[PDB]
Design a protein around this ligand. Structure first.
Ligand SMILES: *P(=O)(O)OCC(C)(C)[C@@H](O)C(=O)NCCC(=O)NCCNC(=O)Cc1ccc(C2=C3CC[C@@H](OC(=O)NCCNC(=O)CCNC(=O)[C@H](O)C(C)(C)COP(*)(=O)O)CCC[C@H]3C(C)=NN2)cc1
Lengths: 1036, 554
């Protein structure tokens, strides 16, 4: 029975034991709150004496006679009993058959790992002895994870053996007093806890981007299936990292942690990374602490950050400084350190622990020192693995790494490549200390040559001719066919060719040499196609001077281009502002000029085409292209996809932009028929539907936004002719709705989702899904013929598949430069290191190679949203908006507050009148908290930039009830919740995380509820929802 | 010094180490740093491993090596001393005739007490204990202490033969009373030594002014005098123990502590006392405003040896009390029966030398350390005696530190720093339990004189306070053990109470203390209380909740 005499003393839990008791009560989804130590002891141990020596050990330590009382108290307590004998089970198996011994042993050990300790009842240690053979004893210890860390066992077993040597030889004891853990409590009380938390709140300041490593699947379960991948660095490398440490005057542990930082910088891409170091939170300030048994071991956020040009030595010192400065405050529990971060619970997700002294060969090290009857001959330990990855490191003659990894979430190929990259970092850093943090390569040569396979596959032997000859070599094949039609009037291929010859001859007589530029201020009309091709047979760069644009920007295009001549119709000439002659294409002299061809002096590299665009910089950019670029793209388009002689193809896009002056030649060079929309009708979707009905258009071009918009006219899309077969699209990061999937499926449409930035060439990568189910955010695609897509870091170094970086585009699909501000050519263009002598163009787009070999799209790096941990893919928010049936048209944008802090926002057009909180609640079901728009504005229509992309800079920035102090749902339940929280009155169903609450309050809450509400309610209930009504089902 | 360099040579396995070398270049690590510090301790040097890691080079780290224990000063200290709380209380109270406010004792040695030996021991004992030379100088209209060197006249010496006088006792009484009045606090000896020779041997009268001694300092002085006397009488040079931290430095540290946050955090408790003590008021038989010390009568009650021995050895165990908790719970019931007050404020003297200053060592330091703190006792809940002893026991542990902070806040701390305090609880009842009355009778080399008479060191010292000084406490209560009997002494003015009313109080004390001894010794089990468990802030209702709850868990 119990009588009050048995309790020695009682204590408040230390913060570490609060951490473990929180865990052991909340995280009961698994049973392994337990450590198991398995030891083998060859020689002849004496069973009785060893059994006695364990009881003397339990009487000696107050820790081992602690029980933890928590169920109904004001506060959890330790309670220490003067006697609490732990179970010792002895088994003799000497007579058993060898397979039966090893079976019965392994069964017992596995059952022991699965049996839980009740913190208020069971003695929190177990021992079993197995006598194998006659001289081959084994012992299994297990203790609760709340008593002490694994390392304390090296103290405990030294006490045990001293007791056993005593009890055998009959000698009295030599053991020193037990160093009291209360001494560390008084020191935790001595430290200024506010100044400590303030330090970490200063260390974690710039922590926007949360670190990750690539996980095979989302964390759908906490149930581990551990595996261990272990590897070592060679002798020559392991002595070299020690030398590097000595020369830079840092510990070797700081070399290893800096190499691991550089890895986590090249994974991801960020110059700012954080991971858990594990620290023995034993302050040197306290006496006897290396012989003190208890939970001292703690995890702290190690945080490596670099500047762009920083050399490894400079980072290595900056890390050294940071770790020496952190050393005072490392006793602060991680759950307090987490409280100061913007990320809270999510802050750390893997560990890197460096072990100069493992438990093996510190426990086993005793051997020669004592005459005890036996030699300890293995020790193995099982522990609660808390994180999906732990990197162990053991500095030895070979630096032995061991990744304790959850094989549920890491592909073994991920872990294997991780080990190869970790060695290749170490190799570079060791061969020369001064190398930068860029230009350290990750890749092994196998993956280097694999990535350099992408440039060499998809090579092509295409004929790469000058451009207008290829139209000629088509018009000769079927001249009588109708080439172009506008309004209700058309040209044949012969007429188009002859009219082009007329214009070209006349332009050449007007002095157009092929290297010159000629403007094309022309309506989207038969004369305009003749314009383009005639200027092209004059050889010139046909400048796409869009007559719809305001006169000031047109004047800029004219003047900045220094153009000698322009081809126009008459009525547009009000927009001309320059010392320039102007060819009225209707002039009678052009009708009198010869229709026959003229001798081509052109060459494939000559200056073919120019474009001006919208942009982030103020001055028009002035792109330029060469004939060889069209040659390569056109052959790819024509031979590897389809446009055909019978196809009625719209030039469905405005002349100002990249796709328009490729969809044209894509029709002529394949022999199709071009239809031109009367451009006012291009603004009238209902009339576009009518036009397509009247003209039976069979191949389509849609801007990404235009494709977001068209299929919301659900009745017109139902009324749509079934003649459609292919859609071409461009512009970044298309959103596909399930509705528009249905409308593609209805007509088995070949959606060619091309991509490509206008300066390299108009497209360079391709996706299609004619029958297969389409992703809601379609990938970029494959690289096309004779192009090298690459992903490179700021050192121009490759980086491994499945990891993000800047997209670089190379091959035949690359312009000459920019026309003016020409050193922007040096900022944007380079010679490719990986195809020496091929031109290459730096996009600022973030992109990734996928497992299937497609490229994947992450948006422009200057636009990179990184809100509160998350590299949020904005298209998902738009997807959940546009898939909501009550929404027609909606847009999500990055906006900044009055401090400059970023916040998500949405602009919405509805199907019907409703309370907007309904669609906010729909997103609150469909989206995590970090990616629902912070606020919403509702509108009649969303305008666009004339390229069709929404004018986010023009759209106006937004601007701009549940309390329950006297309106209880159930009086007792809410009043108790208020009395527990204490800091404020509480709302009708107020949220504990919006209130910023913490785990210690949560345990005090549940333990109050257990007596004050009498609800036998799982603590998991409070971590599912803080909504107070949940208790009503439990109290009834 | 180069000890540290040789310890790097050992722990970093390296010869010919350069004088400038860097710990991390030498191949060091935190595992070597802890071993370096664990090595220096064998030379009695302490170094922080944190400092070794931050300053990785020989000389930078050597500038922060410290000795593993502080050496207290060996010199003849001198100069100014700040008035400590009880000294400033003494000069504040402004007694008539303040110079004659002494403590004294008379020693005896049957085989004689040779004059020149004791003079040489006095020369040493006064040179070594750097407080017995104080001078109080009344400069600028305050009082300022000055502690002075070997300026001569360290003590005042006299020798007399009484063997020729038919009444030895009256002769020594008359001359010791004559010595007491000669104290000058200004520029004169505070120590008066007189040697009386008698037919059965020699006696030593010591008188020392109360501003520089207390009970513990008398235990120090007697054992250092006995050691010096033995040394000189055998013949060797006098070697007294090592001087702990001198009273000057204690005063300076107490000035510097008196304004720290640690002390000021006691203000909510002493506020919670004073605000609750305000109206508590002892009845009197006669209203008289002040009385001179000659009006102090006293009377005594004695426990028999068997009941005393039950008290000292057995009766504590039933509640893990200290002796004081039982003597106070009896005083509580005695006031409850005699006055029928509901609440009473009793002033307790503490021994004063608490670990208030972390570096400070004071066990060998001579001076007036006594602290005064009030204790409010409940008399309301007196009915179930088992629960009244637990209440009284708990009060003594609830009191911050051991009350040393109260007098510092009253007399030393800066007057804007101390907030709500309104120090208006004057002494009315004062209590002090002396232990064995054996500060004197604890070495065979001499013994307490039979002739001590009115010159004793305790409460029954008639002579050491001026007859014309004022009675600063209405009732003064002291216990001591003599001959194994506990003797409780009640000192009171015969102008404020009549003898039959204090005889009531002292008999009503005796019955209630014998009740508490019987109760706590007949009770077979032990009942601990919340102050026994390391839970900071445990309460009775909660402690019995947890002891029900463990009985339901197990
Ligand atoms: P609310 O927010 O919900 O509340 C939060 C909680 C409580 C609910 C919960 O989420 C929470 O945060 N806490 C509990 C769960 C949790 O997430 N853990 C955080 C709490 N702290 C931890 O316990 C973290 C932790 C758990 C488990 C491991 C594992 C280890 C152990 C690591 C490693 O330890 C060692 O023994 N070796 C360390 C290195 N050697 C040392 O001894 C220290 C180094 N320095 C020293 O001082 C040395 O001692 C020397 C030799 C004296 C000198 O060295 P010099 O200074 O360099 C061993 C490896 C085993 C690990 C594995 C694989 N499993 N777990 C780690 C951390």
């Amino acid at each position: 029975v119990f009588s009050k005499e048995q309790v020695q003393d009682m204590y408040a839990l230390t913060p570490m034991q609060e951490g473990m008791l929180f865990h052991a009560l909340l995280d009961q989804e698994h049973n392994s709150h337990l450590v198991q130590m398995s030891i083998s002891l060859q020689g002849d141990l004496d069973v009785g004496l060893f059994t006695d020596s364990l009881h003397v050990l339990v009487e000696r330590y107050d820790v081992f006679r602690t029980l933890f009382l928590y169920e109904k108290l004001k506060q959890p307590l330790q309670v220490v009993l003067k006697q609490r004998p732990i179970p010792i089970e002895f088994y003799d198996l000497s007579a058993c058959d060898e397979s039966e011994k090893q079976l019965r042993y392994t069964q017992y050990k596995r059952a022991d790992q699965e049996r839980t300790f009740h913190l208020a009842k069971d003695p929190l240690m177990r021992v079993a002895l197995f006598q194998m053979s006659q001289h081959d004893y084994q012992v299994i210890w297990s203790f609760h994870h709340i008593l002490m860390d694994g390392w304390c066992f090296s103290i405990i077993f030294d006490d045990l053996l001293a007791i056993y040597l005593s009890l055998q030889n009959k000698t009295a004891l030599s053991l020193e007093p037990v160093q009291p853990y209360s001494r560390f409590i008084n020191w935790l009380e001595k430290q200024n806890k506010q100044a400590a938390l303030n330090y970490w709140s200063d260390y974690l300041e710039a922590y926007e981007q949360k670190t990750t490593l690539p996980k095979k699947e989302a964390a759908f379960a906490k149930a581990f299936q551990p595996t261990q991948y272990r590897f070592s660095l060679n002798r020559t490398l392991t002595k070299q990292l020690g030398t590097i440490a000595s020369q830079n005057q840092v510990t070797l542990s700081t070399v290893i942690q800096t190499i691991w930082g550089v890895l986590l910088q090249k994974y991801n891409a960020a110059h700012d990374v954080l991971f858990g170091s594990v620290v023995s939170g034993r302050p040197t300030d306290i006496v006897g602490i290396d012989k003190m048994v208890g939970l001292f071991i703690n995890t702290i956020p190690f945080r490596v950050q670099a500047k762009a040009g920083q050399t490894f030595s400079e980072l290595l010192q900056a890390v050294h400084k940071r770790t020496l400065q952190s050393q005072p405050y490392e006793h602060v529990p991680l759950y307090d350190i987490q409280t100061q971060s913007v990320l809270k619970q999510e802050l750390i997700d893997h560990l890197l622990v460096i072990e100069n002294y493992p438990l093996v060969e510190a426990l086993q090290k005793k051997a020669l020192n004592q005459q005890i009857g036996f030699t300890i001959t293995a020790v193995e330990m099982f522990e609660p693995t808390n994180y999906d990855l732990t990197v162990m490191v053991m500095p030895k003659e070979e630096l032995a790494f061991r990744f304790d990894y959850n094989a549920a979430l890491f592909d073994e190929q991920v872990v294997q490549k991780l080990a190869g990259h970790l060695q290749q970092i170490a190799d570079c850093v060791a061969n020369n200390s001064g190398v930068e943090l860029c230009q350290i390569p990750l890749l092994t040569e196998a993956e280097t040559s694999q990535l350099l396979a992408k440039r060499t596959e998809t090579a092509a032997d295409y004929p790469a001719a000058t451009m207008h000859e290829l139209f000629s070599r088509q018009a000769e094949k079927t001249p009588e066919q109708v080439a172009v039609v506008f309004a209700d009037q058309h040209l044949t291929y012969r007429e188009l060719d002859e009219k082009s010859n007329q214009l070209a001859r006349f332009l050449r007589k007007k002095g157009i040499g092929t290297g010159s530029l000629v403007g094309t201020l022309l309506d989207r009309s038969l004369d305009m196609i003749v314009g383009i091709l005639g200027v092209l047979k004059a050889g010139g760069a046909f400048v796409p001077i869009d007559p719809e644009l305001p006169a000031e920007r047109i004047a800029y295009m004219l003047t900045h281009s220094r153009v000698p001549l322009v081809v126009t119709q008459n009525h547009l000439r009000a927009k001309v502002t320059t010392p320039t002659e102007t060819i009225d294409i209707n002039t009678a002299v052009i009708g009198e000029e010869s229709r026959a061809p003229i001798e081509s002096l052109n060459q494939p590299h000559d200056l073919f085409y120019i474009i001006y665009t919208s942009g982030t910089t103020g001055q028009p950019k002035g792109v330029m292209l060469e004939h060889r670029n069209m040659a390569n793209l056109m052959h790819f388009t024509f031979d590897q996809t389809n446009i055909a002689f019978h196809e009625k193809v719209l030039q469905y896009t405005t002349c100002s932009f990249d796709v328009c002056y490729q969809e044209i030649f894509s029709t002529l060079l394949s022999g199709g028929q071009l239809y031109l929309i009367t451009n006012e009708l291009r603004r009238h979707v209902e009339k576009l539907f009518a036009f397509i009905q009247e003209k039976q258009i069979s191949i389509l071009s849609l801007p990404v936004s235009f494709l977001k918009f068209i299929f919301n006219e659900q009745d017109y899309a139902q009324s749509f002719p079934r003649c459609v077969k292919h859609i071409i699209t461009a512009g970044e990061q298309l959103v596909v709705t399930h509705e528009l999937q249905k409308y593609l499926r209805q007509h088995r449409v070949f959606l060619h989702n091309h991509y490509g930035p206008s300066e390299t060439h108009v497209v360079t990568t391709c996706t299609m899904d004619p029958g297969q189910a389409i992703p809601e955010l379609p990938p970029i695609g494959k690289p096309i013929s004779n192009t090298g897509i690459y992903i490179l870091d700021e050192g121009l170094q490759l980086k491994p598949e499945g990891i993000v970086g800047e997209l670089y585009i190379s091959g035949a699909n690359v312009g000459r430069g920019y026309l003016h501000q020409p050193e922007l050519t040096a900022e944007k263009f380079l010679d490719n290191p990986y195809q020496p002598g091929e031109r290459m163009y730096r996009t600022g787009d973030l992109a990734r190679w996928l497992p299937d070999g497609q490229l994947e799209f992450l948006g422009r790096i200057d636009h990179q949203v990184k809100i509160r941990g998350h590299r949020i893919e904005l298209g998902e928010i738009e997807s959940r908006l546009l898939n909501h049936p009550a929404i027609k048209e909606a847009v999500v944008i990055d906006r900044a507050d009055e401090t400059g802090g970023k916040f998500l926002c949405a602009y919405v057009v509805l199907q019907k009148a409703l309370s907007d909180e309904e669609m906010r609640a729909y997103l609150a079901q469909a989206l995590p908290e970090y990616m629902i728009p912070s606020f919403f504005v509702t509108l009649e229509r969303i305008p666009v930039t004339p390229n069709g992309k929404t004018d986010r800079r023009a759209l106006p920035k937004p601007e701009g009830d549940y309390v329950a102090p006297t309106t209880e749902l159930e009086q007792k339940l809410v009043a108790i919740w208020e009395q527990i929280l204490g800091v404020s009155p509480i709302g009708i169903q107020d949220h504990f995380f919006t209130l910023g609450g913490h785990s210690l309050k949560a345990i005090q809450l549940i333990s109050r509820i257990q007596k004050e509400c009498q609800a036998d309610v799982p603590l998991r209930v409070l971590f599912e929802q803080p909504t107070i009504q949940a208790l009503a089902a439990y109290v009834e | 010094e180069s000890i540290l360099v040789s310890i790097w040579q050992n722990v970093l396995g390296i010869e010919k180490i350069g004088i400038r070398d860097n710990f991390y270049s030498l191949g060091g690590d935190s595992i070597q740093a802890i071993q370096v510090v664990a090595r220096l301790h064998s030379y009695q040097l302490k170094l922080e491993t944190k400092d070794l890691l931050n300053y990785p080079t020989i000389e930078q780290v050597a500038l922060f090596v410290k000795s593993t224990t502080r050496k207290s000063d060996q010199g003849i200290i001198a100069g100014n001393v700040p008035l400590t709380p009880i000294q400033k209380w003494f000069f504040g109270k402004n007694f008539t005739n303040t110079g004659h406010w002494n403590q004294s004792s008379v020693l005896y040695r049957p085989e004689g007490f040779d004059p020149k030996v004791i003079q040489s021991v006095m020369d040493k004992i006064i040179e070594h204990h750097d407080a017995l030379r104080m001078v109080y100088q009344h400069e600028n209209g305050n009082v300022v202490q000055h502690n002075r060197g070997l300026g001569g006249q360290l003590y005042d010496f006299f020798s007399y033969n009484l063997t020729a006088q038919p009444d030895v006792q009256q002769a020594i009484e008359a001359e010791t009373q004559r010595l007491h009045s000669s104290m000058n606090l200004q520029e004169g000896p505070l120590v008066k030594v007189a040697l009386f020779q008698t037919l059965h041997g020699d006696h030593l009268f010591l008188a020392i002014h109360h501003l520089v001694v207390d009970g513990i300092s008398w235990r120090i002085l007697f054992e250092d005098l006995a050691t010096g006397y033995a040394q000189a009488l055998a013949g060797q040079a006098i070697s007294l123990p090592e001087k702990t931290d001198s009273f000057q430095s204690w005063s300076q540290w107490l000035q510097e502590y008196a304004n720290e946050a640690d002390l000021l955090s006691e203000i909510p408790y002493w506020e919670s006392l004073e605000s609750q003590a305000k109206n508590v008021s002892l009845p009197k038989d006669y209203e008289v405003t002040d009385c001179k010390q000659k009006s102090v009568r006293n009377m005594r009650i004695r426990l028999h040896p068997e009941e005393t021995e039950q008290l000292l050895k057995h009766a504590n165990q039933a509640y893990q009390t200290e002796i004081n908790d039982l003597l106070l719970a009896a005083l509580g019931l005695a006031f409850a029966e005699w006055s029928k007050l509901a609440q009473i404020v009793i002033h307790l003297e503490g021994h004063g030398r608490e670990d208030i200053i972390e570096q400070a060592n004071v066990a060998r330091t001579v001076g007036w350390f006594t602290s005064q703190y009030p204790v409010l006792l409940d008399l309301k809940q007196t009915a179930p005696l088992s629960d009244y002893i637990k209440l009284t026991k708990e009060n003594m542990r609830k009191i911050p530190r051991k009350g040393i902070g109260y007098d510092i806040l009253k007399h030393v701390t800066l007057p804007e720093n101390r907030g709500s305090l309104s120090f208006r609880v004057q002494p009315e009842v004062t209590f002090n339990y002396l232990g064995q009355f054996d500060a004197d009778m604890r070495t065979e080399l001499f013994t307490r004189s039979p002739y001590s008479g009115g010159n004793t060191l305790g409460a029954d010292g008639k002579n050491n306070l001026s007859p014309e000084s004022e009675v600063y406490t209405a009732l003064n209560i002291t216990g001591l053990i003599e001959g194994g009997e506990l003797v409780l002494t009640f000192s009171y003015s015969s102008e404020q109470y009549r003898e039959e009313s204090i005889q009531q109080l002292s008999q009503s004390y005796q019955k209630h203390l014998l009740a508490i001894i019987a109760h706590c010794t007949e009770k077979k089990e032990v009942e601990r209380t919340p102050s026994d468990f390391s839970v900071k802030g445990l309460q009775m209702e909660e402690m019995d909740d947890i002891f029900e709850l463990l009985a339901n868990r197990l």
